[PDB]
Design a protein around this ligand. Structure first.
Ligand SMILES: C/C=C(\C)CC/C=C(\C)CC/C=C(\C)CCC=C(C)C
Lengths: 234, 243
């Protein structure tokens, strides 16, 4: 990716590394930080920073944009911790989970602590951002309930897609480019459904990328590559 | 029982009505049932009662303010979130002769329901301003730390973080909303002690009731006899704790 995005991503990583740094008791801090400290892909923050750079290169190092990327990664951590408890997971890709190592109680309380932290950070981004994240959370909750209730098809859109779309929507709300929201939402949702795993899914994504390109033009390159590259995997 | 103003009881009915709207048409059904369980089998509505009674004593006209009614409902929702999660952590299959949501649907739904409620409360708090939102998130983190200390076998340090933070928010929210910051410090002390005392439902217990009396006295010096219904309520809660 572009050097500027990589640099942004480093600030985000440094910001995430401070979360819970002095949290007490220690059992809570470890449960909170496990998924911050274990090596991850940082898909969501990356999608957000690259989408920003593509739409407004100037705003890449904007403090609100960096904080938003951190927020979306913290909400992803909350989802991991909760899924571990829902599904009683002992491992997540070869690595023992917080619930396995520290109990379900600590895992739950750490997700609560992180939701509050996410909210504290979101407040600075304004009321529209806070309300939107809360709507996102209610969609994820509904999806989990739908899955527990035996409706994998109805739960597909609400299962993990909301965070991916939030990665694309937050920068739009923050920067004021509301005209791209409806498409960014649509794309994020398709990207999300694809992620859980099918030919025309990477086709629509192609179209929505098209519409977006008709708005920002070629400045969309970096983001198109990432999507396309992410597209190739599937 | 309750010797409180009919205006406070009336406000409480409107809070009950607002709470009855929460998650009304929510799907799926198991989510709706888990979410509304502790709202339909209602408790003593102590947290909303404290907020409303305190508001009435500081500013009587504000008991009809939509923001105050919303704040009362939010404090009850967070209490409901705490019940749902506590059911799961302590494995309660019944909570006062009634099957708990975790027992009926499994731990997953209780947790998810709590998640939906946290989100719903944030949505409601946004309408009350950034300070309310920030404050509630700080309350949430304290509750978290409190519960962690518990699980950690640290009842000592857990005393003030486990439930007190919500009792405190019942008194501090209305002050923030009405911009009466001068009383916040005392409201926090008072609320924290009331919460510590109310945790159980002896030597120290009276030392605590004495401290509360002094915080009440400080509020009285500030608002005069208008504080009387709140004072009766605190003395009543103190009473049962000492019974
Ligand atoms: C027994 C008590 C426990 C387990 C703590 C429950 C945690 C609660 C009730 C707080 C949930 C609220 C948040 C995580 C964020 C709330 C912030 C706003 C509504 C602005």
């Amino acid at each position: 990716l572009p050097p500027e995005v990589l640099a942004a991503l480093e600030r985000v990583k440094a910001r995430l590394n401070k979360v819970g740094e002095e949290l007490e008791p220690i059992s809570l801090r470890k449960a909170v930080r496990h998924y911050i400290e274990t090596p991850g892909k940082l898909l969501r923050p990356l999608l957000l920073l690259t989408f920003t750079y593509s739409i407004d290169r100037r705003s890449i190092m904007d403090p609100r944009i960096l904080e938003a990327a951190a927020i979306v990664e913290l909400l992803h951590v909350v989802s991991l911790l909760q899924d571990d408890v829902m599904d009683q997971h002992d491992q997540r890709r070869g690595i023992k989970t917080p619930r396995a190592m520290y109990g379900d109680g600590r895992a739950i309380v750490a997700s609560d602590w992180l939701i509050a932290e996410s909210i504290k950070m979101a407040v600075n981004l304004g009321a529209d951002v806070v309300t939107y994240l809360a709507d996102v959370a209610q969609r994820l909750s509904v999806g989990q309930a739908l899955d527990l209730e035996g409706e994998r098809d109805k739960a597909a859109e609400f299962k993990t897609a909301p965070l991916i779309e939030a990665a694309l929507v937050m920068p739009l709300v923050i920067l004021g480019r509301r005209e791209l929201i409806e498409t960014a939402k649509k794309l994020g949702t398709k990207l999300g459904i694809l992620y859980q795993y099918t030919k025309s899914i990477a086709n629509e994504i192609g179209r929505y990328l098209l519409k977006i390109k008709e708005h920002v033009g070629d400045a969309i390159a970096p983001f198109e590559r990432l999507i396309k590259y992410l597209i190739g995997k599937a």
